[PDB]
């Protein structure tokens, strides 16, 4: 329970799998993800 | 020559610490943990 995968989706259409943090708050993952 | 993260751990919990900038990451892991 301490992570998940997800699909994140990205500008003009691309789709990629990524293994998030389950706890931090959204705010703090955006800025590396992006 | 040194750099500065925000290392993320336990539930999410932010906290700032200070690196080698050439030491290799696994001889540093170990005493940073």
């Known amino acids: 329970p301490q992570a998940v995968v ?3 989706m990205a500008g003009e259409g ?3 799998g ?3 943090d389950a706890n ?3 705010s ?3 800025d590396p993800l992006l």
Do not use: D, K, W
């Open 6 to 8: 997800v699909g994140v």
């Open 14 to 16: 691309v789709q990629i």
């Open 18 to 20: 990524v293994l998030l």
């Open 24 to 26: 931090a708050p959204v």
């Open 28 to 30: 703090v993952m955006t």
